[PDB]
Amino acid sequence: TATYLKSIMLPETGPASIPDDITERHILKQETSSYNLEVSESGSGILVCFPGAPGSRIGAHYRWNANQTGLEFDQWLETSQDLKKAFNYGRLISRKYDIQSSTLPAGLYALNGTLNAATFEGSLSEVESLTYNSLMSLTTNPQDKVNNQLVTKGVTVLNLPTGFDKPYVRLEDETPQGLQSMNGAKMRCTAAIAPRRYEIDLPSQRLPPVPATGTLTTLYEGNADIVNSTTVTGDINFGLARQPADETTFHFQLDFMGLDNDVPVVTVVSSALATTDNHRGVSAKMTQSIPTENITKPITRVKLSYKINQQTAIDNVATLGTMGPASVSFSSGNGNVPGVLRPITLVAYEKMTPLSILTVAGVSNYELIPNPELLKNMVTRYGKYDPEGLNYAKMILSHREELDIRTVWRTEEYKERTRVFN
Amino acid sequence: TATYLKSIMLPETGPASIPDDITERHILKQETSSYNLEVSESGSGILVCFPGAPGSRIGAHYRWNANQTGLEFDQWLETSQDLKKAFNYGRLISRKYDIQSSTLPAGLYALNGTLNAATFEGSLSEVESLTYNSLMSLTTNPQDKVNNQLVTKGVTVLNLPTGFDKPYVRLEDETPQGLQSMNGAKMRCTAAIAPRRYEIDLPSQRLPPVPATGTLTTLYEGNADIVNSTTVTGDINFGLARQPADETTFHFQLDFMGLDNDVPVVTVVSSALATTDNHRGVSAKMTQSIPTENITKPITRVKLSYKINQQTAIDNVATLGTMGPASVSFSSGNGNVPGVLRPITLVAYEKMTPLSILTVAGVSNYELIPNPELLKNMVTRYGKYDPEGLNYAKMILSHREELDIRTVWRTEEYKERTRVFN
Amino acid sequence: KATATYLKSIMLPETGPASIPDDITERHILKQETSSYNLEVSESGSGILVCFPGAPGSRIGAHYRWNANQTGLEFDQWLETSQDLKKAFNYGRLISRKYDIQSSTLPAGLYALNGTLNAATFEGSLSEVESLTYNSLMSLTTNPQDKVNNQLVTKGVTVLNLPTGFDKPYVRLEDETPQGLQSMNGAKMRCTAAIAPRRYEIDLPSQRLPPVPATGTLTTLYEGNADIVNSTTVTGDINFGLARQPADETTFHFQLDFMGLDNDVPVVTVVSSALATTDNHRGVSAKMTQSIPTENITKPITRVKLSYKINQQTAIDNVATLGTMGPASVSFSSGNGNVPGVLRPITLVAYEKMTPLSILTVAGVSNYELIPNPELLKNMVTRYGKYDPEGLNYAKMILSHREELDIRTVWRTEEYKERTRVFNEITDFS
Amino acid sequence: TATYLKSIMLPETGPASIPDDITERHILKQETSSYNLEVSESGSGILVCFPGAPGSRIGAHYRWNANQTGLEFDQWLETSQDLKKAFNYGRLISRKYDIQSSTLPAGLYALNGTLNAATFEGSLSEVESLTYNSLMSLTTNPQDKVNNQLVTKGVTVLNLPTGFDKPYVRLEDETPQGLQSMNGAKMRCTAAIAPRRYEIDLPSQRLPPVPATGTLTTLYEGNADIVNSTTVTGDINFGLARQPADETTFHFQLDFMGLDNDVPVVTVVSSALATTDNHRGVSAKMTQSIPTENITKPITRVKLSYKINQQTAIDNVATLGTMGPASVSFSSGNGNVPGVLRPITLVAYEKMTPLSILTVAGVSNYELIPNPELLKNMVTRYGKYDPEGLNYAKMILSHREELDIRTVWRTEEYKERTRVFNEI
């Protein structure tokens, strides 16, 4: 008994079936991650942990440039194997990170570098400043924060479950295909189980005047965050004042960006054509679908903008909404599943010794469902019937202030404070 | 212990956390709502209650016209605070309404009025007639109806949970927008979790003829309820019979109306064009996205139309369904979340004294999740760990008939039968 | 008690004044000034009473009434004292205040009248209220001692004033100064209130000005919420550089009109002009050096709208980016608005659905310690306080224990009337 | 009782409400800072502290260039949370910094660095020489200095109050704005309570001749310090000696700088067309308003310059004061509030190995008044009513010298010498 709470508290002692009502025929599997990140020239950076995200991507790694004016995206933090090549559905029992430098000092003093870590029950886009200083100002729970820990003593980022009846989620696997496919066109059973919808929702005023032809004047830019395949559904209707002398195109842009620099991860264009016939209602439909492989890095910003090609019609005010709401939306995968996009843990290091080694070390315990190619050889069973295992975890989570269990640790307060679940 | 049932029966005794499986870090907040409703000169009107809606709108009010020929929308019933300005996610614990008049104007001797209240497991597009005598047939459950109740004694509308593992729902809040937006564009993380889709499915026969140019003849009209943002998908495709002599437009309409009058709440237009080339493959696509702020009143009817702009094209039958099924879909928000749009509680008052006042006092109990601005200055924790208490609140929901645990009460029998729950 | 004389003036402001026993010790004059209003309820049967509890002065509140169809409000009148203080005095603090709002129609039969009354104390400035609505003002505070909802309009509500701070300064009262016989006809200098101002800055960004639709059509630049209640000075400038030198002389009006919270006709507007010419087309500064007397502030100001317009039909494509000759902003500082009590905190009393043509009575009372003007300074003796050492210290523990003692800024007038007798009103016989 | 002096003495033990006369409903909130400053190649620098500033900017950091001829602004130091976004008014209760190195870079096996510190009472622009060993000659109070302290042991800076009835200060936050705002404009409720005003007072003699057209001659250069929103008022009025053959503009600058390097932090402009009619009464109005996001780094200098745009106008002497005193004033925020702009505490470091880390750890305590959105959900209340409260705190400040209560400590002395104050 109580072999599921022990797997939450100690995620490296192996997986265990979530003893809840969503009982399927699954596979218990533990997957690890091992990185040796080379500290950049400014010795500073931030690594975003998604501790409850069921999948292969468990984190991202950004690093400050020399002047610490901006960040650069180093790489994702995946697991050992890409789970979608042998599994179609998956959950997450447990996860644990060990962010800790591996540079043993010879002398009696430590090398220079510290760690701030905060569990922010929001999303990456909702953070206003990503900086080692302004991380304590993301929560107020004393169990979600750790400040000024030596980088050679390390922080353990536990994952405390956010809900207990989470659904098995598609892993973006690939379907069989024929031999007459194009060359590299594939098809995926992507994630769509509880989407996260956004909507730019422009008002019914005139379009801003563009300074020149083909200059891409901005219409809106906000903070929406995206991790996997999205569908863009909307339209941008507008009526011109006077019928155009020539015919104008009205290019619309909608590019997506990251939190580090203004080079668009994905851009998605729609076009119109203002003609003498339809000069009173023109519509540019956004019906584009964005696969999950074009998202090379996390997305935290969108920007909608437009440009016109005709030299004239630069004074053709073109009021919006002449055929309806004039709104553009997009929906994304499993954004609104507890664990994806929310919550997140931020671990930031400052002034680590230039060209030294930070070693992240992750452990995940999944509940997976093999793909048909693997059912031939893998036996799939049910949960092991723990009747009390979830009440015990609910009791542990409800008293996390007296017992001082926490999402983020000091790795030595952790290594010492959890040997009672053995 | 047994403190979650107390918050169901006595929504005024404050909120208690749901002991179900979804365990988050939340905020227990109570909201009140108090309205003094002017009664029209007819005296009749009708209230709509959404006793399970987790949002910030808890009902609507319609007032019959001078001779009960039609209704008119009065206003939305909502809570005191606008939850979507300080919170992101939320789910409802319990709610309670209290109706009465019990007061009359300066010099008057006659106080007359009666109440019919019945809980309906439909969605208010399902109701056929909202008249005072009608809505006693909306259910055949004994403990869901109250008829011929004196307006001075009033009805208390309770809320019984239709399910327990409800998900937290995005409250349609604005996202942090950068500069360079145009003037008033704004993006909201709308609701997507468990939507409600309506397929139109026009049959692939001849398009009915227009009597004249630009007169908007009907293609379909029906009942479908929408309260939050929605996205419209599909396309009407059709091939002309011979060939267009000159270019025609085929302007499609798709208006949305409420139950009171026939002025559309919001209209989404899509305009095709039949040229000589595509004269057998004309297609009018629907991609519009309706923000949840264009829904001013409860939408209950949908009507699709079309019209042409050329005289020569009254003939040229223009058969549907050449390129595909020629259908039109639209999905909305949390339509299929149990609590939104289901169930409804109708409360009909009948011939109150003209120019008298009806009193609606509601108290909701939510479990909210703050927004990043509020996370820094507010502690968010887990539930109180009632191990039982869900079973204790589910035994009552099953023995409700031998316990007479009602959804609609007479205020005087409620105010004394529920004192057993401390 | 020998002590508890100052506290007795806060809890029972009807029983006359009592000098504030703080460190601001001047030779002053104790005065009690009363307010009385019988308000004619309008056909909407609804309205709002914006109280100003800690406001030292004559104006102690405002009365707004909803229009017929309950869409927007209308400004009835200022709620002030019976006699004008600034005629006889020069300086003043406020010791305590109390408002009593009540329906004086009082039905004859067995059923009460249809009128209900909401009241909440908001630690804001009447521009920080997103919406004034009978339902909307029950979530303005979580403090249970600042909220009363669903009070029957005949039983009434009491709005007690609790001091926020104790070393408040003596503020000038906008008395007008002596003048020679050569003034034109209506000029008058006033010693206006300027001690601890509240400042706003509109802060335009340094980029292209929005395009104007036509000539003289007043394009909007900014509109937000900034409450002003007395005299103010506008200080700023707007500068811009034209794309290319103009074909003619463009004027570029700027409007900056202040607006109340009820209708969009400006309470006061003030215009500046910058004539862009051939030579100085690269920098065109519109100086904003304005001073609005409190005599122009007719009703409470809650919103602002900065707008502009050009007069040449040409030059309508001269994009005119801002910020050339510096930050390109405009500012206006108003009176003594950061003095605690002025503009914050305020109390809102909403009456909803009363009988039209019924009567709503309002009976204020305000104890001041004032300083006479020279005219009656030759007849009144001004002296120091009463020397109660523990007077302030006794009131400090009352405010700190106001939860367990249940000391409220908003009452039901039957729990106020019955719960304020421990503060002596009982005449212990000799 | 005695629970407020404990907060002044040991700020790390949490905030406590001030027992003074300013009694308003408020929120007690403790905010931390954490900084790892990078020592440059000169191994030197200076770390300014604003121990009593109720805002969010609690200090700047400077470095000395290679040959120590001048400084360079590195960065502001500031609380983790941006207070203005969730609060309108605030008062500071306590604030303690903490400075050390205690660690070493890659290829180093010996650490070295010494550390001067002194509690000034001017305003960061009244100091004349700001070198490592000159800031010892800025005070004579033994309780306000520490000399040649090893950087590995550390200097603690403590905030002893200067006054007790400080008002709640506006935190410069946003106001609600409706639609129709142009693109990115924004109105803020800035600080104005107790301003600080300078005036440049030019004499009514002739303007100094300009060398060439458009060459920016200098009229005044001096030391004034600004940290927030500033209004400029005044005018320069002059009369040309004779008829101007061609109209001149007379560009007047008045730009502001920091102490690091003479690049303008904020520059302003005013022009005065001298035409043939008003050549007896030309005047250049100055009516600008400088918001607080333009003050990117501390300002400690102003320069008022001018220039002409015509060739013939280099003669025609243009004497000042023809229509009045001809001065240019500017009043800034709430400079004269005790705690803002004074007292300053400077901590200088030198002889440190380049690329080593200088750790700063601040912890502040505030009384804050939540903004309307946060006000709807959090409850505000009054002080905790300690009647004596201040007399105990006021007693220690008077017995400062015999009890040795310092603003600038050395850490090992601070850690143990102040354990006395652990009692509730």
Author numbering:
A (entry chain E), B (entry chain D): 7 to 428
C (entry chain C): 5 to 434
D (entry chain B): 7 to 430
Task: Please share excerpts from the published article on this structure.
The infectious pancreatic necrosis virus (IPNV), a member of the Aquabirnavirus, can infect diverse salmonid species, leading to lethal outcomes characterized by pancreatic necrosis and catarrhal enteritis. Birnaviruses have a bi-segmented dsRNA genome. On the contrary, VP2s assemble into a 60–70 nm T=13 icosahedral single-layer capsid to protect the RNPs. The VP2 subunits are organized into three domains: the α-helix-rich N and C-terminal base (B) domain located on the capsid interior; the conserved β-barrel jelly roll fold shell (S) domain; and the unique β-barrel jelly roll fold projection (P) domain, which is situated on the capsid exterior.
The first infectious IPNV capsid structure was determined at a resolution of 2.75 Å using cryo-EM single particle analysis with imposed icosahedral symmetry. From another perspective, five subunits (a) form a pentagonal unit at the 5-fold axis, while the remaining subunits contribute to hexagonal units in the capsid. While the overall structure of the VP2 subunits is similar, notable structural variations are observed in the C-terminal region of the B domain (residues 429–435) and the variable loop region of the S domain (residues 110–117) (5-fold, down, and up conformations). A comparison between the cryo-EM structures of the infectious T=13 IBDV and IPNV particles similarly reveals differences in these surface loops, reinforcing earlier observations made from the T=1 structures. Both IPNV and IBDV form four corresponding surface loops: L1 (IPNV: 206–222, IBDV: 204–222), L2 (IPNV: 245–260, IBDV: 245–260), L3 (IPNV: 277–287, IBDV: 277–284), and L4 (IPNV: 313–323, IBDV: 313–322), while an additional loop, L4′ (326-334), is unique to IPNV. However, the variable loop of the other 12 VP2 subunits in the asymmetric unit adopts either an up or down conformation, contributing to the formation of the necessary structural interfaces within the hexagonal capsomers in the T=13 capsid lattice. The Tyr115 residues of the three up conformations largely contribute to forming the interface. Specifically, this intensity was observed from Glu429 to Ser435 in subunit (a), Glu429 to Ile430 in subunit (b), and Glu429 to Ser434 in subunit (c). The C-terminal extensions create an additional hydrophobic interface and interlock with neighboring subunits on the capsid interior.
